[PDB]
Amino acid sequence: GAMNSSNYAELFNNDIKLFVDDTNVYRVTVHKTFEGNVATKAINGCIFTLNPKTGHLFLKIIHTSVWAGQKRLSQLAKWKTAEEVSALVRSLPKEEQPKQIIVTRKAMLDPLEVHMLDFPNIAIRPTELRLPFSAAMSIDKLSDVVMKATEPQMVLFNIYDDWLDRISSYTAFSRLTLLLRALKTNEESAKMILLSDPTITIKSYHLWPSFTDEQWITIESQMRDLILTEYGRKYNV
């Protein structure tokens, strides 16, 4: 069934599952033409496919070339997403294939189900959660590999960096969601917080700064102030 507040710990059990988010697959800028009409220019996008237990991110870069000569791009994007997740699963050894795939938008259920007919024992689930994975393009390194790509490409990142050496997947997921929620609500502040202290560095193959345990609790606190605050500035409370 659907994934929600109540069956949330299932993400951290030992059954392999992937989250799929398709919100950054099809991306455009909107501009005016010489005749004063409006047109879109596509830019590179990406499929966000995440193992929430291990932190494995199978970032498939969607190059603008996949749209050339296509119609109805918003709909094509959902089938293209499903084509790529299916290809990923197929490329995986049996013991590494997910038992479940959870899509973050219900529009992805039918495309993925149809592309995964060959895998009847993989459950395709929706979720009731309003997860902030769209803000993945507010992570500098991820946005950078996407924008620089000149061809279709699959890049790997551990979105948890090295965190699991010290904390559990449940805690790691909670940290990630808080950071992404912050980045989504106020990208400028969120980033200001993360990078205020020049001495804290980001490791070449990491995404986030190398905070000590104590520095993460402060950061996490400041991201929570951010998310409450922007809620006030938005709702006047």
């Binding site: 094509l76 089938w79 499903a82 039918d110 495309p111 189900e113 149809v114 592309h115 007919l117 060959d118």
Partner: protein
């Protein structure tokens, strides 16, 4: 014209013949139905006065034998049976006609309704959906489940409709996942029409038979089958012009004949709005859409 005599009417029952029905009281002197038009299939069906649960009946074609009804007090229902002694049958019928204890199939001469509901329905195909080969007639009731319903429990009592499933490997060609799912023309024209049904007439006869089982017995899986066969045509961008034109006539008479007050259970909001307003054929069902809008504008 043909006759289906009854031995007697021991229990109060509403008897139906095609789209006509009449009440018979317990032990009322009733010996059957005469003047039944040759050349069509028919259905005679029953709802006991005491158990509105279980409607039940027999699909039959008089050209294939002499058939009669006899109450069975052990099994508690009206059973169709075949009389093989042709002389004993003409004999029984002629007496009952002489004593005028038979109701007359009450066909108005202007009315092509039954013909248009059963245009493509053959007994040979009915007997493949309802398997009971020792009899020439076919028993259906309200509660019989379909082969596809049994996939998702007694197989001898199943309705063996052709399984349609829009999210199945049969429906979806590897590599055409989006194309085939958004435009089911392959599934309709190649898998089902060319492959399983062979021609549009056999497809339309199953469709029509599913509708009638839904209408007359409230058979839920028949209703599911009728809506699926409609939806596959409406969701195909490429349909022979002749199939569309006939479809519009087929569905027009089904909608016209449906009981006004049963429409809320037998008609699937999603399929009809999709077929009439969103699907590739939204512009190809003029008669069906006109009658749907003037009769059931609520469902839309």
């Amino acid at each position: 014209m043909n006759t289906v005599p009854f031995t007697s009417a021991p229990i109060e029952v509403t008897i139906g013949i095609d789209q006509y029905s009449f009440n018979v009281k317990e032990n009322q002197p009733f010996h059957g139905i005469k003047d039944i038009p040759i050349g069509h299939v028919h259905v005679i069906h029953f709802q006991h006065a005491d158990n509105s649960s279980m409607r039940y009946g027999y699909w039959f074609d008089c050209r294939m034998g002499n058939f009669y009804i006899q109450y069975d007090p052990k099994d508690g229902l009206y059973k169709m049976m075949e009389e093989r002694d042709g002389a004993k049958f003409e004999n029984i019928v002629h007496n009952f006609k002489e004593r005028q204890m038979m109701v007359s199939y009450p066909k108005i001469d202007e009315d092509d309704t039954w013909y248009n509901l059963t245009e493509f329905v053959q007994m040979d195909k009915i007997r493949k959906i309802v398997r009971k080969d020792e009899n020439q007639f076919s028993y259906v009731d309200s509660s019989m489940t379909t082969v596809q319903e049994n996939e998702l429990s007694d197989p001898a009592h199943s309705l063996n409709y052709t399984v349609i499933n829009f999210k199945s490997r049969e429906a979806i060609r590897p590599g055409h996942e989006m194309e085939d799912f958004l435009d089911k023309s392959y599934y309709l024209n190649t898998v089902m029409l060319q492959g399983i049904f062979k021609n549009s007439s056999n497809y339309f006869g199953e469709l029509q038979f599913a509708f009638l089982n839904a209408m007359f017995f409230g058979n839920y899986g028949s209703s599911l089958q009728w809506h699926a066969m409609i939806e596959l045509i409406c969701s195909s961008a490429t349909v022979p012009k002749h199939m569309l034109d006939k479809l519009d006539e087929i569905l027009y008479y089904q909608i016209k004949t449906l009981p006004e007050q049963y429409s809320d259970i037998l008609l699937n909001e999603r399929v009809w709005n999709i077929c009439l307003y969103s699907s590739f054929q939204k512009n190809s069902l003029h008669n069906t859409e006109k009658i749907m809008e003037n009769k059931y504008p609520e469902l839309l």
